[PDB]
Motif scaffolding. Structure first.
Motif, PDB file in Angstrom:
ATOM      1  N   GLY A 186       5.303  -5.386  24.273  1.00 36.41           N
ATOM      2  CA  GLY A 186       6.223  -6.448  24.723  1.00 36.41           C
ATOM      3  C   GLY A 186       7.698  -6.097  24.582  1.00 36.41           C
ATOM      4  O   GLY A 186       8.487  -7.022  24.349  1.00 36.41           O
ATOM      5  N   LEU A 187       8.072  -4.827  24.697  1.00 37.16           N
ATOM      6  CA  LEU A 187       9.511  -4.465  24.737  1.00 37.16           C
ATOM      7  C   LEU A 187      10.121  -4.654  26.122  1.00 37.16           C
ATOM      8  O   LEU A 187      11.356  -4.726  26.168  1.00 37.16           O
ATOM      9  CB  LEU A 187       9.741  -3.034  24.255  1.00 37.16           C
ATOM     10  CG  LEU A 187       9.618  -2.806  22.760  1.00 37.16           C
ATOM     11  CD1 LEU A 187       9.839  -1.339  22.475  1.00 37.16           C
ATOM     12  CD2 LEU A 187      10.553  -3.655  21.912  1.00 37.16           C
ATOM     13  N   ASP A 188       9.366  -4.653  27.221  1.00 38.86           N
ATOM     14  CA  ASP A 188       9.979  -4.831  28.563  1.00 38.86           C
ATOM     15  C   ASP A 188      10.678  -6.199  28.562  1.00 38.86           C
ATOM     16  O   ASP A 188       9.976  -7.221  28.358  1.00 38.86           O
ATOM     17  CB  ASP A 188       8.995  -4.577  29.720  1.00 38.86           C
ATOM     18  CG  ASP A 188       9.604  -4.662  31.118  1.00 38.86           C
ATOM     19  OD1 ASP A 188      10.826  -4.509  31.229  1.00 38.86           O
ATOM     20  OD2 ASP A 188       8.840  -4.874  32.126  1.00 38.86           O
ATOM     21  N   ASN A 189      12.010  -6.177  28.730  1.00 41.12           N
ATOM     22  CA  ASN A 189      12.904  -7.346  28.842  1.00 41.12           C
ATOM     23  C   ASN A 189      13.061  -8.029  27.487  1.00 41.12           C
ATOM     24  O   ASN A 189      13.544  -9.169  27.448  1.00 41.12           O
ATOM     25  CB  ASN A 189      12.412  -8.337  29.908  1.00 41.12           C
ATOM     26  CG  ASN A 189      12.121  -7.683  31.243  1.00 41.12           C
ATOM     27  OD1 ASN A 189      12.948  -6.939  31.753  1.00 41.12           O
ATOM     28  ND2 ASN A 189      10.941  -7.934  31.792  1.00 41.12           N
ATOM     29  N   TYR A 190      12.684  -7.386  26.377  1.00 38.47           N
ATOM     30  CA  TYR A 190      12.887  -8.038  25.064  1.00 38.47           C
ATOM     31  C   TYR A 190      14.386  -8.128  24.788  1.00 38.47           C
ATOM     32  O   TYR A 190      15.103  -7.126  24.914  1.00 38.47           O
ATOM     33  CB  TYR A 190      12.139  -7.282  23.966  1.00 38.47           C
ATOM     34  CG  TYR A 190      12.113  -8.055  22.684  1.00 38.47           C
ATOM     35  CD1 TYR A 190      13.083  -7.872  21.737  1.00 38.47           C
ATOM     36  CD2 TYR A 190      11.041  -8.881  22.389  1.00 38.47           C
ATOM     37  CE1 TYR A 190      13.131  -8.656  20.600  1.00 38.47           C
ATOM     38  CE2 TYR A 190      11.044  -9.653  21.238  1.00 38.47           C
ATOM     39  CZ  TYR A 190      12.063  -9.492  20.324  1.00 38.47           C
ATOM     40  OH  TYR A 190      12.037 -10.233  19.182  1.00 38.47           O
ATOM     41  N   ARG A 191      14.852  -9.315  24.356  1.00 41.92           N
ATOM     42  CA  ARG A 191      16.303  -9.604  24.203  1.00 41.92           C
ATOM     43  C   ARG A 191      17.054  -9.178  25.468  1.00 41.92           C
ATOM     44  O   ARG A 191      18.260  -8.802  25.384  1.00 41.92           O
ATOM     45  CB  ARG A 191      16.866  -8.941  22.937  1.00 41.92           C
ATOM     46  CG  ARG A 191      16.405  -9.577  21.631  1.00 41.92           C
ATOM     47  CD  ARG A 191      16.426 -11.082  21.684  1.00 41.92           C
ATOM     48  NE  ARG A 191      16.515 -11.747  20.393  1.00 41.92           N
ATOM     49  CZ  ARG A 191      15.538 -12.422  19.788  1.00 41.92           C
ATOM     50  NH1 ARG A 191      14.339 -12.538  20.331  1.00 41.92           N
ATOM     51  NH2 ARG A 191      15.784 -13.014  18.634  1.00 41.92           N
ATOM     52  N   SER A 211       1.295   7.937  14.999  1.00 42.75           N
ATOM     53  CA  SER A 211       0.972   8.025  16.443  1.00 42.75           C
ATOM     54  C   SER A 211       0.811   6.621  17.057  1.00 42.75           C
ATOM     55  O   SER A 211       0.985   6.493  18.272  1.00 42.75           O
ATOM     56  CB  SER A 211      -0.237   8.867  16.704  1.00 42.75           C
ATOM     57  OG  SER A 211      -1.374   8.306  16.088  1.00 42.75           O
ATOM     58  N   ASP A 212       0.619   5.593  16.222  1.00 43.40           N
ATOM     59  CA  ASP A 212       0.511   4.169  16.617  1.00 43.40           C
ATOM     60  C   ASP A 212       1.909   3.543  16.517  1.00 43.40           C
ATOM     61  O   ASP A 212       2.417   3.452  15.420  1.00 43.40           O
ATOM     62  CB  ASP A 212      -0.469   3.459  15.679  1.00 43.40           C
ATOM     63  CG  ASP A 212      -0.666   1.980  15.972  1.00 43.40           C
ATOM     64  OD1 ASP A 212       0.187   1.384  16.639  1.00 43.40           O
ATOM     65  OD2 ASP A 212      -1.719   1.447  15.555  1.00 43.40           O
ATOM     66  N   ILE A 213       2.545   3.213  17.631  1.00 47.49           N
ATOM     67  CA  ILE A 213       3.986   2.823  17.658  1.00 47.49           C
ATOM     68  C   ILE A 213       4.137   1.356  17.226  1.00 47.49           C
ATOM     69  O   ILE A 213       5.254   0.868  17.207  1.00 47.49           O
ATOM     70  CB  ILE A 213       4.637   3.122  19.021  1.00 47.49           C
ATOM     71  CG1 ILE A 213       4.100   2.248  20.162  1.00 47.49           C
ATOM     72  CG2 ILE A 213       4.518   4.597  19.370  1.00 47.49           C
ATOM     73  CD1 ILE A 213       5.025   2.210  21.372  1.00 47.49           C
ATOM     74  N   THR A 214       3.047   0.634  16.933  1.00 45.14           N
ATOM     75  CA  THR A 214       3.175  -0.790  16.528  1.00 45.14           C
ATOM     76  C   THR A 214       4.295  -1.024  15.514  1.00 45.14           C
ATOM     77  O   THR A 214       5.100  -1.954  15.726  1.00 45.14           O
ATOM     78  CB  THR A 214       1.882  -1.357  15.914  1.00 45.14           C
ATOM     79  OG1 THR A 214       0.915  -1.073  16.911  1.00 45.14           O
ATOM     80  CG2 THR A 214       1.954  -2.823  15.559  1.00 45.14           C
ATOM     81  N   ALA A 215       4.365  -0.259  14.436  1.00 50.30           N
ATOM     82  CA  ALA A 215       5.328  -0.591  13.362  1.00 50.30           C
ATOM     83  C   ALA A 215       6.743  -0.334  13.894  1.00 50.30           C
ATOM     84  O   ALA A 215       7.622  -1.127  13.604  1.00 50.30           O
ATOM     85  CB  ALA A 215       5.031   0.207  12.097  1.00 50.30           C
ATOM     86  N   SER A 216       6.948   0.746  14.646  1.00 51.26           N
ATOM     87  CA  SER A 216       8.274   1.037  15.243  1.00 51.26           C
ATOM     88  C   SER A 216       8.662  -0.075  16.212  1.00 51.26           C
ATOM     89  O   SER A 216       9.826  -0.493  16.170  1.00 51.26           O
ATOM     90  CB  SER A 216       8.250   2.337  15.965  1.00 51.26           C
ATOM     91  OG  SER A 216       8.446   3.388  15.022  1.00 51.26           O
ATOM     92  N   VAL A 217       7.731  -0.543  17.065  1.00 51.72           N
ATOM     93  CA  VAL A 217       8.110  -1.604  18.050  1.00 51.72           C
ATOM     94  C   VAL A 217       8.469  -2.873  17.264  1.00 51.72           C
ATOM     95  O   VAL A 217       9.445  -3.539  17.602  1.00 51.72           O
ATOM     96  CB  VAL A 217       6.996  -1.844  19.069  1.00 51.72           C
ATOM     97  CG1 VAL A 217       7.279  -3.077  19.930  1.00 51.72           C
ATOM     98  CG2 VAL A 217       6.787  -0.632  19.946  1.00 51.72           C
ATOM     99  N   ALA A 233       4.163   2.698  29.073  1.00 55.92           N
ATOM    100  CA  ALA A 233       2.967   1.833  29.052  1.00 55.92           C
ATOM    101  C   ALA A 233       2.797   1.181  27.671  1.00 55.92           C
ATOM    102  O   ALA A 233       2.547  -0.037  27.586  1.00 55.92           O
ATOM    103  CB  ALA A 233       1.765   2.643  29.472  1.00 55.92           C
ATOM    104  N   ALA A 234       2.851   1.979  26.601  1.00 53.86           N
ATOM    105  CA  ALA A 234       2.705   1.456  25.234  1.00 53.86           C
ATOM    106  C   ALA A 234       3.799   0.453  24.938  1.00 53.86           C
ATOM    107  O   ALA A 234       3.532  -0.634  24.333  1.00 53.86           O
ATOM    108  CB  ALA A 234       2.688   2.615  24.256  1.00 53.86           C
ATOM    109  N   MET A 235       5.060   0.818  25.239  1.00 55.16           N
ATOM    110  CA  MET A 235       6.177  -0.106  24.921  1.00 55.16           C
ATOM    111  C   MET A 235       5.975  -1.433  25.674  1.00 55.16           C
ATOM    112  O   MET A 235       6.215  -2.503  25.075  1.00 55.16           O
ATOM    113  CB  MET A 235       7.508   0.514  25.333  1.00 55.16           C
ATOM    114  CG  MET A 235       7.939   1.668  24.446  1.00 55.16           C
ATOM    115  SD  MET A 235       9.537   2.270  24.963  1.00 55.16           S
ATOM    116  CE  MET A 235      10.097   2.954  23.396  1.00 55.16           C
TER     117      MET A 235
END
Length: 129
Positions: free
Chosen positions: A16-21, A86-92, A10-12
């Motif tokens: 906006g990682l779904d279908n990224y590149r 715990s906030d994945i923003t920087a990793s994504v 859900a977070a990913m």
């Protein structure tokens, strides 16, 4: 933070990682499972003296500054400790730059060895997405 599988999916997707590149959400959940067991606090030292950080094991040799990887780059312009939140923003945000680097998700060794050529759709089974 140790994410639940559907929780991370859900977070990913939201970031906006779904279908990224061209990589489906299942690829990203599979990579996070086998890079970190979905634990944002995961760290692992590398032989060249760099470290891998966070739920997608981003390396200090290129992507972030940890103050102990001499002559390294910081292409995501972030302290590596940002990648353990715990906030994945920087990793994504950093993962989007890594996967855009032209090697695709082959930058993630656990993806290459445990995900690529498998039916990564299995990793989003049962989730309301």
């Amino acid at each position: 933070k140790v994410f639940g599988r559907c929780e991370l999916a859900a977070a990913m997707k939201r970031h906006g990682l779904d279908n990224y590149r061209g990589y489906s959400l299942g690829n990203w959940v599979c990579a996070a499972k086998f890079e970190s067991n979905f634990n944002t606090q995961a760290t692992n030292r590398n032989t060249d003296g760099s470290t891998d950080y966070g739920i997608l094991q981003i390396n200090s040799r290129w992507w972030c500054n940890d103050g102990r990887t001499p002559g390294s780059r910081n292409l995501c312009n972030i302290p590596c400790s940002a990648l353990l939140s715990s906030d994945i923003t920087a990793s994504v945000n950093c993962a989007k730059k890594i996967v855009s680097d032209g090697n695709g998700m082959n930058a993630w060794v656990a993806w290459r060895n445990r995900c690529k050529g498998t039916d990564v759709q299995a990793w989003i089974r049962g989730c309301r997405l």
